[PDB]
Each structure stands twice: as C-alpha cells, then as structure tokens.
C-alpha cells in the first residue's frame, strides 16, 4: 500500500480530521509532546497525505491556538505542561489570526 499522494491541509480536511480523532477518543486531555504530535502528523501524513507541517499552534504561555483555521484542537496548560483540548468553536473563530495576524 503506497504512501498517499501529498496534498495541502485544508479547512474542510482539518474539520473532518478533528471530528474523526475526537470520535476515536485520542487527543482529548492527552498531555502534549513534540514527539506525540510528530507521531500524529506523520500518521495523518502517511494515511491522508497532508504534509506534516500544518499543526502549528500560537506562542505561549497560556492556551495555544491552532493557526490552521478549521483544526478544532487547541493546547491548554494542565515551559507549561499542555493538554490537547477539542474546541469546535475554532472551526468558527480563527483566534490565532487575531492574536497573531502576522502569521497570515
């Protein structure tokens, strides 16, 4: 089974992936780590073809908001120890672009 063709992350792709993982009951609460996340990104990359360079969050401290509008996971402190926290409002409020309009 070949590595799927590479493609850009999208708003719609980020919304489906978030709901899918939420269904899977994984990231919720899970303590964040570059390794765990790289593992995630690589899985999504292998499986769906979304190049592993989209899951960037905003600079801390506090909650880190996803730059990818449509990705419904934010990082909530619980270096701060962060936990992946689903928030469907991120599919409706591009917080990161307001806090840091420069990235866009």
């Amino acid at each position: 089974r070949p590595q799927v063709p590479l493609r850009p992350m999208t708003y719609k792709a980020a919304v489906d992936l978030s709901h899918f993982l939420k269904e899977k009951g994984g990231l919720e609460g899970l303590i964040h780590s570059q390794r765990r996340q790289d593992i995630l990104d690589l899985w999504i990359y292998h499986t769906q073809g979304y190049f592993p360079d989209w899951q960037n969050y905003t600079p801390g401290p506090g909650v880190r908001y996803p730059l990818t509008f449509g990705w419904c996971y934010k990082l909530v402190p619980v270096r701060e120890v962060l936990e992946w926290r689903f928030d469907s409002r991120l599919a409706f409020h591009h917080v990161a672009r307001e806090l840091h309009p420069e990235y866009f």
Binding site: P2, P5, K12, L17, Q48
Partner: protein, 57 residues
C-alpha cells in the same frame, strides 16, 4: 478509459472516495494534481482518490 483500484482506501475527509481493491472508476478530473476526482462505477459516488492507488482497466 476506466481505472481499477489496486489497494483499499478509507477516506476520513468527506470529499475523498473510499473504495476497495478491484473497484472501478471513471476519472472526472486529473489536471488539478495527483489526487484525482473519480466517480465510482459501482455506486455513482464521486470524490478524490490517491491516483497512485488506481491503474487503467
């Protein structure tokens, strides 16, 4: 020019088309990249498939 699925594919996104090995497709768009827009001959369902998972019939 029909195509046949060489492997199984399970979409997670909504615009992707899940399919099983052996399923046959008719490509609607293939110039927009390596993820083609295919129509299932079996179900009439349209969506994007990993072009590298299908081969001509």
């Amino acid at each position: 020019a029909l195509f046949v699925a060489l492997y199984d594919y399970e979409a997670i996104t909504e615009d992707d088309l899940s399919f099983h090995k052996g399923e046959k497709f008719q490509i609607l768009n293939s110039s927009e990249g390596d993820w083609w827009e295919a129509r299932s001959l079996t179900t009439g369902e349209t969506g994007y498939i990993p072009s590298n998972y299908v081969a001509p019939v």
